[PDB]
């Protein structure tokens, strides 16, 4: 498992493996970091979210969200304090990806759904 302290630091480590692949605005990343997905994303920002989810092993390369695998991965992704919120959001957003065809959009829309269904503070790497 991870502690809250390890979680908050993991956010930066995850970002470091994905951000360099894209052209991104710091203010966009700042907003996603606090779960504010309330602004139009660029293609780059959407594909950044796919890179993050791919690292997490929660989507495939087609951006299809894998709910059972996400649930299995949660202890490697969030601290105990965030487990139930995350469980609830996986359940609410498991089918979000089926409304979209393009892989980066599929992941971005699912992440946005997580942020919107989060009954507490939501943080994206």
Tally of structural domains: 1
Radius of gyration: 13 Å
CATH topology value? Recoverin, domain 1
Number of helices: 6
Overall, the morphology is globular
Strand content: under 5%
Residues in helix, %: 40-55%
CATH architecture level-2 label:
Orthogonal Bundle
Give me the secondary-structure category. mainly alpha
Compute the separation of the termini in Å: 18 Å
Mind summarizing the main beta sheet? Answer: none
Fourth-level CATH superfamily: Pheromone/general odorant binding protein domain
Order of helices and strands: HHHHHH
> How many strand segments?
0
For the record, what CATH class applies?
A: Mainly Alpha
Binding site for ethanol: 53, 58
Subcellular location: Secreted
Family: Belongs to the PBP/GOBP family.
Disulfide bonds: 18-51, 47-104, 93-113
Concise synopsis of the structure shown:
This protein has 125 residues and is mainly α.
Task: Give a verbal description of the structure.
The radius of gyration is 13 Å and the shape is globular. The protein has a single domain (1-125), classed as Pheromone/general odorant binding protein domain (Recoverin, domain 1), CATH 1.10.238. It has helices spanning 4-16, 26-33, 43-56, 67-73, 83-93, 103-117. Helix 5 crosses helix 6. The protein is mainly α and 125 residues long. The protein is built from six helices and no strands. It is classed as transport protein. Keywords: Odorant Binding, Alcohol Binding, Behavior, Olfaction, Pheromone response, Pheromone-binding, Secreted, Sensory transduction, Transport, transport protein. It forms a monomeric assembly. Complex of S52A Substituted Drosophila LUSH protein with Butanol. The protein: General odorant-binding protein lush.
């Amino acid at each position: 498992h991870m502690t809250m302290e390890q979680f908050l630091t993991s956010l930066d480590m995850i970002r470091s493996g994905c951000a360099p692949k894209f052209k991104l605005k710091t203010e966009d990343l700042d907003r996603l970091r606090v779960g504010d997905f309330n602004f139009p994303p660029s293609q780059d920002l959407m594909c950044y979210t796919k890179c993050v989810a791919l690292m997490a092993g929660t989507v495939n390369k087609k951006g299809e969200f894998n709910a059972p695998k996400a649930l299995a991965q949660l202890p490697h992704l969030v601290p105990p304090e965030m487990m139930e919120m995350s469980r609830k959001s996986v359940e609410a957003c498991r089918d979000t990806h089926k409304q979209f065809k393009e892989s980066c959009e599929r992941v971005y829309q699912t992440a946005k759904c997580f942020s919107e269904n989060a009954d507490g503070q939501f943080m994206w790497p």
